[PDB]
C-alpha cells in the first residue's frame, strides 16, 4: 500500500535530518548565497589556506582534513542506518559488512551536496575550497578530488533533494550483494521495499523527470567505481608515503575491503 510507502519515505527523511546536521538544502543555500549572515571563507591558494586555519605540506594537510571529515561522516551515516526499519534486527556481522562497504558510497553521494562546478564546502560550510586549487595539489593527491567533482556535477544535474537522498542512501546501505554477507535474503527484502518507496518518491517529487528512477539506480553502480578508483589511489599513497597512515576508523573500514 502506497500510504505505507509514504510513511516509510517520511520516517527516512526525518531520520536523515536527525543524523546529518548539514543538509543539501542548507548547503545549496550557502553556495548560492541565499543564507542569512554568513558567506564562507574562500580557500584558493597556499595563503588562502593558511588564513583558513584561523577561521606537513599542503596536500597532506588537506588529505587529513578529508579524513577527519570522513570519520565524522561514518558516525553520522551509522546513526542514520540504525533508523532504517529492520536494519538493527539484522545479524550484527551483516550490519558491520553493510556499513563497511556502503559508507564511502554515501560519503561521495553526500559530498556532491556540498559541491558545484567550482569548489566544495568544508567544515560545516564555513569554507569553500576551489576546484582549481584542489587540482594544483602535488601528485598523487590532486587526482583524489577531480573524479569526485566529475560525478557530483552530473549527480547534481538530477536535482535530488534531501527527502530523495534519504531513501537513496537507505537503498545503498541495504545491498544484498556486499562481499561476505551471511544472510542475504532479509537484506534484499528490506531493500525491495526501500526501492518501492524510492520509485514512488521520485515519481511524486519529480513527475516531469524522465526515467529518474532508472537514472538513479545507475548512479548507485557508478558510486562503486568511484570507490574502486579511490582505494587504488590510497594503495599508491600507502606504498609511497610509508610514514603516513590513515585514521584508525578508516583503517578498519578499508582492511579486507574487496
Amino acid at each position: 500500500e502506497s500510504a505505507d510507502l509514504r510513511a516509510l519515505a517520511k520516517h527516512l527523511y526525518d531520520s536523515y535530518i536527525k543524523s546529518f546536521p548539514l543538509t543539501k538544502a542548507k548547503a545549496r543555500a550557502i553556495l548560492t548565497g541565499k543564507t542569512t549572515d554568513k558567506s564562507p571563507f574562500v580557500i584558493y591558494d597556499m595563503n588562502s589556506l593558511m588564513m583558513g586555519e584561523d577561521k606537513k605540506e599542503v596536500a597532506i594537510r588537506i588529505f587529513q582534513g578529508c579524513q577527519f571529515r570522513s570519520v565524522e561522516a561514518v558516525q553520522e551515516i551509522t546513526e542514520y542506518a540504525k533508523s532504517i526499519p529492520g536494519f538493527v534486527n539484522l545479524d550484527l556481522n551483516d550490519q558491520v559488512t553493510l556499513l563497511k562497504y556502503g559508507v564511502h558510497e554515501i560519503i561521495y553521494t553526500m559530498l556532491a551536496s556540498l559541491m558545484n562546478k567550482d569548489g566544495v564546502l568544508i567544515s560545516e560550510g564555513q569554507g569553500f575550497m576551489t576546484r582549481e586549487f584542489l587540482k594544483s595539489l602535488r601528485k598523487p593527491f590532486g587526482d583524489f578530488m577531480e573524479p569526485k567533482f566529475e560525478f557530483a556535477v552530473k549527480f547534481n544535474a538530477l536535482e535530488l533533494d534531501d527527502s530523495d537522498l534519504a531513501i537513496f542512501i537507505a537503498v545503498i546501505i541495504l545491498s544484498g550483494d556486499r562481499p561476505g554477507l551471511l544472510n542475504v535474503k532479509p537484506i534484499e527484502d528490506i531493500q525491495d521495499n526501500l526501492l518501492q518507496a524510492l520509485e514512488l518518491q521520485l515519481k511524486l517529487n519529480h513527475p516531469e523527470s524522465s526515467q529518474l528512477f532508472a537514472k538513479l539506480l545507475q548512479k548507485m553502480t557508478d558510486l562503486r567505481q568511484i570507490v574502486t578508483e579511490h582505494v587504488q589511489l590510497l594503495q599508491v599513497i600507502k606504498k609511497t608515503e610509508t610514514d603516513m597512515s590513515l585514521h584508525p576508523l578508516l583503517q578498519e573500514i578499508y582492511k579486507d575491503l574487496y
Binding site: 561514518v74 558516525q75 551509522t78 540504525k82 558491520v96 556499513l99 563497511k100 584508525p248
Partner: peptide
C-alpha cells in the same frame, strides 16, 4: 571493532 561499538550504542 569501532564499527561494532557505533552500531550498538544507544
Amino acid at each position: 571493532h569501532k564499527l561494532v561499538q557505533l552500531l550498538t550504542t544507544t
